[PDB]
């Protein structure tokens, strides 16, 4: 792998470049530029408790053109008002076999890390959960997925570490699916509003494959 140890990181720098996003529920109508829009709000020292330190790779991997990195938002709430959502925020399908040309069978280790933000989530009235399908295409209506938000140590939680990015690191080294999709399910309500009672916004940014000869 000419990229060693990363195999795939995106940056979300186009509409659906790296990500693509589905709305299955927007009861209280949210507009959709609030739901899954780019925003420049991405990780840096200064807003991740000094974790996110490393320079970013120049360009988008595989696909070896700049990089421009945008983070996606889910607005939950807005004008004082908790929308109830279900938006889903899916990576690319992509073959964490060795068939992968990125991939060796001496890799031993696989992992994802992500990085996630929620600011003004107050209450546990908002969520972001993280699930794997090895069967989606084109709609998370019609894949099977396997919830997976017990196996990360940290994420963007309601009432926790406002306005900080925090890093998730998720072990995949069991999976060798060729057609290999994770996804981001935002949920929130549409109870009333208060300063301890809100969906806030949630943010996904640095979505990272690699590999690993040693355990992480």
């Given at each position: 792998?000419?990229?060693?140890?990363?195999?795939?990181?995106?940056?979300?720098?186009?509409?659906?470049?790296?990500?693509?996003?589905?709305?299955?529920?927007?009861?209280?109508?949210?507009?959709?530029?609030?739901?899954?829009?780019?925003?420049?709000?991405?990780?840096?020292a200064a807003?991740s408790n000094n974790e996110?330190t490393?320079?970013?790779?120049?360009?988008?991997?595989?696909?070896?053109?700049?990089?421009?990195?945008?983070?996606?938002?889910?607005?939950?709430?807005?004008?004082?008002?908790?929308?109830?959502?279900?938006?889903?925020?899916?990576?690319?399908?992509?073959?964490?076999?060795?068939?992968?040309?990125?991939?060796?069978?001496?890799?031993?280790?696989?992992?994802?890390?992500?990085?996630?933000?929620?600011?003004?989530?107050?209450?546990?009235?908002?969520?972001?959960?993280?699930?794997?399908?090895?069967?989606?295409?084109?709609?998370?209506?019609?894949?099977?997925?396997?919830?997976?938000?017990?196996?990360?140590?940290?994420?963007?939680?309601?009432?926790?570490?406002?306005?900080?990015?925090?890093?998730?690191?998720?072990?995949?080294?069991?999976?060798?699916?060729?057609?290999?999709?994770?996804?981001?399910?935002?949920?929130?309500?549409?109870?009333?509003?208060?300063?301890?009672?809100?969906?806030?916004?949630?943010?996904?940014?640095?979505?990272?494959?690699?590999?690993?000869?040693?355990?992480?």
């Amino acid at each position: 792998n000419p990229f060693y140890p990363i195999f795939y990181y995106e940056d979300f720098g186009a509409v659906n470049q790296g990500y693509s996003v589905q709305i299955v529920k927007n009861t209280n109508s949210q507009n959709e530029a609030q739901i899954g829009k780019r925003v420049n709000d991405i990780p840096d020292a200064a807003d991740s408790n000094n974790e996110f330190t490393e320079a970013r790779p120049a360009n988008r991997i595989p696909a070896n053109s700049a990089r421009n990195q945008k983070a996606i938002a889910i607005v939950g709430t807005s004008s004082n008002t908790n929308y109830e959502l279900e938006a889903w925020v899916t990576m690319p399908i992509i073959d964490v076999s060795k068939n992968n040309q990125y991939i060796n069978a001496d890799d031993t280790f696989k992992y994802v890390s992500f990085w996630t933000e929620q600011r003004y989530a107050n209450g546990g009235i908002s969520s972001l959960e993280v699930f794997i399908s090895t069967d989606y295409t084109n709609n998370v209506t019609t894949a099977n997925w396997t919830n997976v938000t017990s196996n990360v140590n940290k994420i963007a939680t309601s009432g926790q570490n406002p306005q900080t990015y925090v890093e998730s690191l998720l072990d995949i080294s069991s999976y060798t699916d060729t057609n290999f999709t994770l996804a981001f399910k935002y949920t929130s309500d549409n109870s009333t509003y208060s300063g301890s009672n809100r969906n806030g916004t949630f943010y996904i940014s640095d979505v990272k494959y690699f590999v690993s000869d040693t355990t992480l």
